[PDB]
């Protein structure tokens, strides 16, 4: 216990004086989250996040900010300690640092939509106290892109990316409402009510007006907010609580609620009932159940790495091992904090609900410039891009974090009916296609679709034909089902989605003369595009996905998949073109011995490799799509045939970025390349100081730690996410990091479990990870030797293959 705690020994740090909100700690219960900090004056401040606080603009909003100010500063000169305790699910502040009980104890109940702030003066001497609601959305705020200055409004272009093509080039951020507080009461309350919605105009632009009566508006009249109260407080204003009598021990309770409401009073009635109900619960019983929830969560799985004690080693290896261990845990803490949405909202890759900021003063605000510092901002806006989001969820399987995965699958399942009707209308065949990115309700945004597009093919070439996510989602769900053996999940979530995706892939294209499907028009992820409709033929990601997924669907238990489904899937499988293969040639910048960047530059003497497609043009991004057959689809890798094909492909890759969504490290682990994998894990989760980087001086991809935040695991986006400083935490970075470390330890080969496929011997490790058939593997490697291995259930031990650390 304490193994993952984060301890700070001072209120002061690099940005405390001018930007204390950059020194927050995150904490959540899966739906409600806080970013909490202590300012140099001793105030406790926190921003409030919620997974489903979607505004009229589709913007994910903070619920607000709260400031607690004791009448007498509670800090002392002697010492100070602020600690994140993940196994108790809490943040605690001690002053002095050795005080027996914390000055501030902050937690979000694992089991209820309430957060608690408990205060205890160290002297036991009573104090007055005031809590202020700090809302910044008090009047409508204009964000405008002006004709001569398109690049100036980063808030417009990046924070409202999905709306960038709105006619008129104006986004208005509607304000919030503070409810009148009851005179003499101990409660204040506030919320945001969506009085309008972008959804009807979007359906009309996308030729889907006919679906408007069938699927209700997902934004209109959505109302979300919170109630703040505390025993012994009185509302001295609608935005202010104060202690009536000085106290040495007191508490604030924050209850959060989202619903659909005709007005804020209706919302407030339901939220007051929620507060009444939950305030009646015994807080110590709630605290015990909260702590037990977190103890069990951390007992599901772990990876604890350290340097071994063999003479001749390098102490930096131990330093890196420990840093990697802490980072892996902090990623898990943030995903759990945001990963049990009450409304099937996937974890936002661009900051989850743990973004921070501080609004610029109204008097300084310029609508033509916007405000990227404001608390609601996130680079990339609110749409959910699969290429980033998949990396958050893949590692949850080996962690055993099935509950964190269900909202992602549920999101797609709830969108399936609309997207099936859309496909029926657009394409006049069965099935459903899921765009690479779009709004949470499943449709692409109008910028990617095209304002006034007379057709139904997406205008944006980056994602015009990219629908591979549906296949990859199906593969992830198949792993979930194999692990949990949850038949209800199989029948009610996996199968309808798999049915739609597989039917689309069977019906949207035509068989050619050889009887095999010709995948054109098509593209290979976002890197090889098809402006002509003919530039890309037979992309490897999609073909590899069908090769990996269709046999598994065909083999599902009797009475789940239908015999008719099996017949259709078998025919699709039998009609697949081959996985794209070829030889090395000249790649990007005419470099030799590479994956040929124009498909036509293969050299007859080149090494045999996988290709990103059978036919493809020049690159428009920096993905290595040919590697999809290694990860996620496990067609090649250590312990599988044609390992040299996989290795040649990896060595010949054109793109070698690290951190963010870059997934080279995962592929290296899948190929048994322990050194490559270790290096990438160290870049994502630590700092790579090793001299020969294959990268320029001061390459940003040598470390993913935050540039400016005190909680350094608020990852920064990787260089391949583009030029700017993005939004932190970039959870795709930490998701990739988890996949790398897990894949170094454990990989599945159908029913078999391969341990230590790419593990460096200099690292001792104690781990517990999950696998298919409700199996856990708990192992301890010391000085390169497996000292202990416990497999549950025991009969599954016979399916474990133990490889040697390298």
Residue numbers in the entry: 26 to 831
The authors write:
To date, family GH139 is the only family known to be able to degrade α1,2-linked MeFuc, making it essential for RG-II metabolism and a feature of RG-II-degrading bacteria. Crystals of BT0984GH139 formed in space group P212121 and diffracted to a resolution of 2.7 Å, while crystals of SDT91673.1GH139 formed in space group P 6522 and diffracted to 2.05 Å, providing good quality electron density maps in both cases. GH139 enzymes operate via an inverting mechanism in which we propose that N412 functions as the catalytic base and E561 acts as the catalytic acid (BT0984GH139 numbering).
To test whether an ortholog of BT0984GH139 from a soil environment was also an exo-acting 2-O-methyl-α-L-fucosidase, we cloned and recombinantly expressed, in Escherichia coli, SDT91673.1GH139 from Verrucomicrobium sp. However, SDT91673.1GH139 showed no detectable activity on any of the substrates tested. A glycerol molecule from the cryoprotectant occupies the suspected −1 subsite in SDT91673.1GH139, stacking against Trp686 and positioned above N412 and Q411. The SDT91673.1GH139 pocket is substantially more open and exhibits less hydrophobicity compared to BT0984GH139. In contrast, these residues are absent in SDT91673.1GH139. Specifically, W162 and W490 are spatially replaced by R189 and R186, respectively, introducing a more positively charged character. In SDT91673.1GH139, one of the rare (<1%) GH139 sequences that lacks the proposed catalytic acid, E561 (BT0984GH139 numbering), this position is instead occupied by T551. Interestingly, SDT91673.1GH139 belongs to the ∼1% of GH139 sequences that lack a catalytic acid residue, suggesting it may not serve an enzymatic role in Verrucomicrobium sp.
